[PDB]
Design a protein around this ligand. Structure first.
Ligand SMILES: NC(=O)c1ccc[n+]([C@@H]2O[C@H](COP(=O)([O-])OP(=O)(O)OC[C@H]3O[C@@H](n4cnc5c(N)ncnc54)[C@H](O)[C@@H]3O)[C@@H](O)[C@H]2O)c1
Ligand SMILES: NC(=O)c1ccc[n+]([C@@H]2O[C@H](COP(=O)([O-])OP(=O)(O)OC[C@H]3O[C@@H](n4cnc5c(N)ncnc54)[C@H](O)[C@@H]3O)[C@@H](O)[C@H]2O)c1
Ligand SMILES: NC(=O)c1ccc[n+]([C@@H]2O[C@H](COP(=O)([O-])OP(=O)(O)OC[C@H]3O[C@@H](n4cnc5c(N)ncnc54)[C@H](O)[C@@H]3O)[C@@H](O)[C@H]2O)c1
Ligand SMILES: NC(=O)c1ccc[n+]([C@@H]2O[C@H](COP(=O)([O-])OP(=O)(O)OC[C@H]3O[C@@H](n4cnc5c(N)ncnc54)[C@H](O)[C@@H]3O)[C@@H](O)[C@H]2O)c1
Lengths: 334, 333, 333, 332
């Protein structure tokens, strides 16, 4: 039978995960939650997806608009095997006891503390670590991107320094600045480094910044090599690493805008680029240091990771069988 | 099957090319490119033959080992009509070539009315293009203004609209302004006369450019000659094709959420072919009607392009073509 | 000299504080701050006694070793009037506090009209505030509308203006939208009625927010009731105080260049106190006048607050105060 | 008094002209323009003689009623030195004209290293320009890197910095990207070798362009050769000229507030000639120092051009010039 899934928090990550779940033949979307009957709630219903009020506390918002719901999250928790928690950072921790009391497994997003789960997850890097687990944290958008390429060359990395040039807000978020400024994270290192280390063992330090863009994040990566490695070896490795794609600035891929245009060209749902983008020409080796630039489509790179986490937690399949299945259902040729 | 070709596989061209492949009374023969960039490779991957725009550009493709199906001259030999989606002003420069070839041609809104025998917006003056050889589909903004204004023209004594336009399309990263409002000092703006090439209406417009890439926005004022109520306008717009009412009260706070609606639909390139009208903005004060609409400039003109082909070849009547095109693109009403 | 205090050392607050400092008939007793940030340190550095906005804010200061000259309650005891520059809606909550202290108070444009006895724009209705206790200087945009509209009021039968607004001030990095246009679905916009609290005219306005920080832009259309020519309007604007004409032909393509003119003048905080009007935008078509103007929202209500003070304490005639304020701020004409 | 002419009254050009009129050992002979736009008028209003950058441009001022004092050649004959502030690449082109006229010449950062005899940053290699006829003050980004790195040069055996640049200056409204991050796929980028043109140090850089106009920001990592504490670095910066420390805790959340500091100063054009360093960003982890700084690209190289003039004309000793220049601009 199919694993019964519920999604708490039908937000930017949540609705995309819900969609992914509907594309799996071994999983069934029991329902999702919303805190208000806005256009997204109407869309879920329009899609035939049962809409549950996130809590009894939000029920009046629905009743007010005369928007019928299938119940509250408490009702949904009684009919699922696992809940994908896609609520605001920090809110996952608050929901955990509700999940434990209901006896259902739970997946939390990167916005939560490592604290929250038994293990942090990135399919291609530590799938087996989540086997049978009940609580798994799919790391954040930037952490996932960093892990995908760093993990592929971990054996050659002695130390890595990465600068996160982050977008200020997702395309659908119009209530957040900065309109015109660069906001640095003065804490050195940013949360990214240690977060990476909750998935793969590696010496890493990171620094982050926020700039006025909504498209994708960009990573400036520097690795001190403790073992021989050439430029071609690196493109070869990246060329063969799943959920990673090389883009040539020479073909016209000048910025994150053209990278996203590639996804729009594929006619992807929400222009989702599940794959981490690496500028081919940026991969260089000077002395014993490797350098390269990558981009992350933060609205969707963790989508495939949530699906695979589900397979590992229920021991539905081995690592590569799940990744390939997840990949095919989302159009990731990898 | 009407054989179609697209000269200029850019923002409009690639979306019109796609629309053609969804019409079973048509056949996409090929598209042109001036260089083998990632968009040329995409066309090829889609199985669409790509021709070098001109004999001049051939070496660019040869250099990269990118095999082409030929050049625009070769293409012109294989089509009944060419859809020209080259930069504004370049379409006129191509007209002679199309003339000699003996093929019908459709130009986009960036060309002067000069370039064609008539300007077009299906739901407004479809019949005016029946059998023509050269037709120009009006700009993204003119199309948006026409669609809603045409629906209430019988009540319109005078119209004044302000165009708050995006500064550059999302895939255009070489255009400012990054932080400023650029006014068009030519007043009245050229949008009004452009609307008058499609429908008879007293109109005046003014335009501005702001740092956004998503959608243009229009502020419309209409002096009424006949009484009309808020509900009347809502009912008319709800029964007007290729127009959609969005409620700020349901979360549509800005053009970003409007586009989010198209992304939720999983629309190709997040295309919102339809003009978006904020339901709450529709107000009547005295003898004046006010409303706000938004236009997704990357795609509102593509269904107009497909209907123009049907009219020019007299393949179908106005509403039959419109209905068929809408279905092919997922436009409900 | 009139004893002046300013509650709210923010965007408007610190600029009005500086303006007060330039008057030979006024004295700045102090400014209020809710926390010891770099702006509080600046005020202290300038020698401006800094008062904690409230009792419940003194801890933040003590925690940082920042000595304050007391609280708002203390400051009110030492002034004849306080310029309230707190966020919209807070002014109303502060009025009772001011009345109790028995001091006169000036409110900004973010407050409702009823918060004061009269609304105000020096060059329009200076006299209306003579000897008053509570006056509301209308918003940055309302002020821009009044200056230009007041000068042609006698020919205006009806006016429709569209406000294309900056999303956030340069110093405000916590507010969106990054990429979108957000319309105000309420028709009319709050601007029309606020203008009517200063000058009697028929007007309806609509507003939008776009991603820029520099200045707001107004699209103005005026239905005429008396003969008027373009030339007449230019001349009228060339002769109305606090309004300057800019030529696109000289390089003023957008609001960035308008602001660049203020930077070139070395204006404090790049303040452009005067309303900017694109000369080339002025045009009359039939019975309607059109023009485009820009407002530097950070400083255009500054000179108005000063004049408000003189009218309220009846310190001088309308034009003596205006000329006196203008000279102190470098205001051109 | 040395006679200075500025060729290219642009963003850097008009600000340097101002700086010179603020000096007591020099006089602005005139500036040049290609068209009589509003900036050309402003220069005239300031009483600055305006020369048409070239004869072929005279008609432009003739079509208008704009009287000019002549061409670039007429200016070259009345100066001891000319500050070239033309677009990058044009400086090299204009060099043969400066030579045939026998006048010293300073080029800006956009030009290639070979356009001058030595690249310059006053507080780092002032002496290197003493007496020379051709010197290029390095770019905004390199000046910022040099000022801070130079101060800890003796403790760094390796530096890696990432350049997060503003896409267009406040007054440049015809340049993107409006919404995107544009990378420099050439890595390391030209910034490192540019720095190496002023001070001797092992550095590698990478750059990016983002949708902002206010300031560039540098993410800096330094491999230490000698022990160094956070308090050590902070003290060094507090004692390094043309460098200022800012506290996020005091409200400096981003480049916008940093700029706001300059506006509060009522600084001309809101010029922040000094490099900004976020005090809280200074941290040492292992044998590595990390810190973040921001550069106001419109004004950062201004004081540098004034000092280069003194070095080239040997008018003063390193620190005497810098103190004087700093004084004239209100640096502190
Ligand atoms: N690009 C991204 O925004 C991104 C990328 C990677 C990971 N994530 C992670 O996903 C999680 C959420 O991100 P998001 O961007 O989807 O947030 P979001 O703001 O888009 O939506 C989160 C959802 O939480 C819902 N919500 C609020 N309170 C709730 C409650 N009490 N119960 C249930 N739902 C509630 C809201 O309705 C909203 O739909 C975070 O941990 C975040 O770090 C986000
Ligand atoms: N939002 C929009 O971009 C929009 C909306 C409605 C109408 N239009 C109109 O559509 C037309 C094109 O707009 P666009 O957005 O596609 O421009 P675009 O620049 O995005 O794409 C145009 C294409 O024309 C091709 N081209 C350039 N020179 C060519 C040549 N000599 N021969 C053949 N092809 C050549 C280019 O290679 C490019 O692929 C214009 O008239 C424009 O006003 C544009
Ligand atoms: N563009 C503009 O910012 C602009 C233009 C014209 C008019 N105004 C008007 O100015 C008035 C204030 O605007 P602003 O731009 O100065 O806002 P601001 O946020 O820049 O400054 C407000 C000041 O009030 C302070 N504050 C918060 N609570 C306070 C309290 N209880 N007491 C005292 N201060 C408190 C803030 O710390 C700050 O010092 C508003 O009514 C607004 O409509 C603003
Ligand atoms: N932030 C900056 O703008 C910045 C920062 C650091 C270094 N620089 C360097 O300074 C130089 C110019 O920078 P800018 O920003 O001032 O450019 P700018 O565009 O603002 O203008 C440069 C000027 O050159 C004049 N010019 C053009 N052609 C000319 C000609 N043929 N003869 C004379 N003058 C001509 C232009 O009109 C203009 O006034 C470049 O090398 C640039 O890299 C600029």
């Amino acid at each position: 039978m199919k694993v019964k899934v519920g999604v708490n928090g039908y937000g930017t990550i949540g609705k995309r995960v819900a969609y992914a779940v509907t594309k799996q033949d071994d999983m069934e979307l029991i329902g999702i939650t919303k805190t208000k009957p806005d256009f997204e709630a109407y869309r879920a219903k329009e899609l035939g997806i049962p809409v549950y009020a996130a809590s009894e506390e939000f029920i009046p918002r629905f009743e007010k608009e005369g928007f019928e719901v299938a119940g509250t999250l408490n009702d949904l928790l009684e009919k699922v095997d696992i809940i994908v928690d896609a609520t605001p950072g920090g809110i996952g921790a608050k929901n955990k006891p509700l999940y434990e009391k209901a006896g259902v497994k739970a997946i939390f997003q990167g916005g939560e503390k490592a604290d929250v789960a038994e293990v942090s997850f990135v399919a291609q890097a530590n799938y087996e670590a989540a086997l049978g687990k009940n609580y798994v944290r799919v790391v954040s958008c930037n952490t996932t991107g960093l892990v995908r390429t760093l993990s592929a060359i971990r054996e050659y990395a002695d130390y890595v320094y990465a600068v996160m040039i982050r977008r200020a807000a997702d395309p659908n978020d119009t209530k957040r600045g900065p309109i015109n400024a660069i906001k640095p994270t003065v804490e050195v290192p940013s949360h990214h480094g240690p977060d990476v280390q909750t998935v793969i063992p590696i010496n890493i330090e990171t620094m982050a910044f926020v700039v006025p863009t909504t498209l994708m994040h960009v990573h400036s990566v520097m690795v001190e090599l403790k073992k021989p490695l050439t430029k071609d070896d690196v493109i070869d490795i990246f060329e063969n690493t799943t959920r990673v794609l090389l883009f040539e600035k020479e073909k016209g891929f000048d910025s994150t805008a053209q990278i996203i245009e590639f996804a729009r060209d594929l006619h992807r749902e929400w222009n989702n680029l599940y794959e981490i983008a690496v500028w081919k020409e940026s991969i260089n080796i000077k002395g014993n240091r490797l350098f390269y630039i990558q981009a992350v489509h933060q609205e969707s790179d963790v989508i495939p990771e949530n699906i695979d986490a589900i397979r590992a937690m229920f021991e539905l399949a081995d690592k590569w069988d799940s990744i390939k299945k997840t990949n095919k259902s989302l159009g990731i040729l990898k």
